[PDB]
Each structure stands twice: as structure tokens, then as C-alpha cells.
Design a protein around this ligand. Structure first.
Ligand code: NA
Ligand code: NA
Length: 225
């Protein structure tokens, strides 16, 4: 019952991008009479670009009032602004304990994957300086279903050519945790316990993501699954 892989989400596990997306979406949203707050945005978190835009427009009952071309234009302006913000990310922005985890996973001959809904995930990993640590990066551009649908996590399992039942999925949002469990994987949640209650394991912060602790908990889950 050995682990075949650790599949990570990007935002809130490898590094923090949620605030940058929010700053970028907030600017475009104001231009259509919609002012999103860090509470509403918490439902745009880990969501793909065009879906995220539709939810923002929805919030103002104008999701169906724009043509997709016009939505394409709006998305572009937002993307350019988001890309400008993340281009200042460095290795110092890697969440605490992640590098050490990435190393230990690799020393235990276990694959590593990233299942992020962002087509900017590659750009971010290169700025962090750890793109070489990832065996497979799911292409959000080919994913047709956002979390909590398990597609993005199944894509990394397919990509790495491993059994999802032997995979560990790490995430900080409830939608992602639902996607991980729906992919029949061991789910590890990072953050608030109440919001991440459906996770198989919940830790407080990325510093709590220790390899031996994750493995001991994984073995427990497998025996009881
Ligand atoms: Na996340
Ligand atoms: Na599970």
C-alpha cells in the first residue's frame, strides 16, 4: 500500500496567489459596477479564468449580458494585470515546509504533480524556482470542469500514470478537498478545520506537512478506507 504520488494545488499550498488574483479581478470588476470583497472572492479561489469571470458577472446579474468575445477581452486585461503582479514572486515566497516536503517525497521515490486551475501555474513555479521538482503539471487549458469536479486531479494521475487510490492530494480550499476525495485520493487540507472538515487529514499550516506524519496518517486511512 505504498504511495505513488503527492499531487499539490498551487495557491495556498506551494505559494500564495489568491490575493494577487483578487487584486486583478477587483480592478476589472469595478469597471462593470461590481465590487467583490475578500469574502465573495473566497468562491473564485482555485477557479479557472473564464469561469471566475462568469461568477463575478453572476454576482451582478450580468453573466449572460456580455458576449464571450467581450468576456475574452475582459479576461485578457485581467490576465495581463495578474501576470504583472506574479512576475515579482521569488523563492522566498515558497510556503514554509514545502521545499523540505518536496525533497523528502522525491527521496522516497514518489512522484510529484501539480493540479492547479491556473494556466499561469508554470510561470509561477519558475519564479519560485521549483518547476524541476514536478514530474507532471496538469494543463488547466485542457480541463473542462472546475473543482469540486475531480478532473484537474485525475489529470495529474493520468499524467504521472499512477493509481489515484495511491495518491495524496494537498489543498487549502473546500472545493479542492471535494475534488481530491471525488478522485478517490487521500485528501490533505491546510488551514481552518471547520472549512476543511471533509479532508481525510487536516493540518494547521504548511509547516505541519511533514513526510513521516503524512505517511503514518496515509497508512491509517488505507487500512480503514
Ligand atoms: Na488551493
Ligand atoms: Na479521500
Amino acid at each position: 500500500a505504498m504511495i505513488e504520488a503527492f499531487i499539490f494545488d498551487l495557491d495556498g499550498v506551494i505559494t500564495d496567489t489568491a490575493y494577487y488574483h483578487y487584486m486583478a479581478w477587483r480592478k476589472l470588476a469595478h469597471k462593470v459596477g461590481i465590487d467583490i470583497d475578500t469574502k465573495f472572492n473566497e468562491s473564485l479561489k482555485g477557479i479557472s479564468r473564464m469561469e471566475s469571470l462568469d461568477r463575478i458577472l453572476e454576482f451582478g446579474n450580468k453573466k449572460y449580458s456580455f458576449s464571450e468575445e467581450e468576456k475574452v477581452r475582459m479576461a485578457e486585461e485581467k490576465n495581463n494585470y495578474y501576470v504583472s503582479l506574479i512576475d515579482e514572486i521569488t523563492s522566498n515566497d515558497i510556503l514554509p515546509g514545502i521545499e523540505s516536503l518536496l525533497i523528502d517525497v522525491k527521496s522516497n521515490n514518489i512522484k510529484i504533480g501539480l493540479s492547479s486551475a491556473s494556466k499561469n501555474a508554470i510561470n509561477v513555479l519558475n519564479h519560485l524556482g521549483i518547476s524541476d521538482k514536478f514530474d507532471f503539471i496538469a494543463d488547466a487549458g485542457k480541463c473542462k470542469n472546475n473543482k469540486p469536479h475531480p478532473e484537474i486531479f485525475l489529470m495529474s494521475a493520468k499524467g504521472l500514470n499512477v493509481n489515484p487510490q495511491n495518491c495524496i492530494g494537498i489543498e487549502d480550499a473546500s472545493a479542492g478537498i471535494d475534488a481530491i476525495n471525488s478522485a478517490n485520493m487521500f485528501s490533505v487540507g491546510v488551514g481552518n478545520y471547520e472549512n476543511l472538515k471533509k479532508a481525510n487529514l487536516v493540518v494547521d499550516s504548511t509547516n505541519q506537512l511533514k513526510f513521516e506524519y503524512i505517511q503514518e496518517k496515509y497508512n491509517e486511512y488505507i487500512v480503514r478506507r
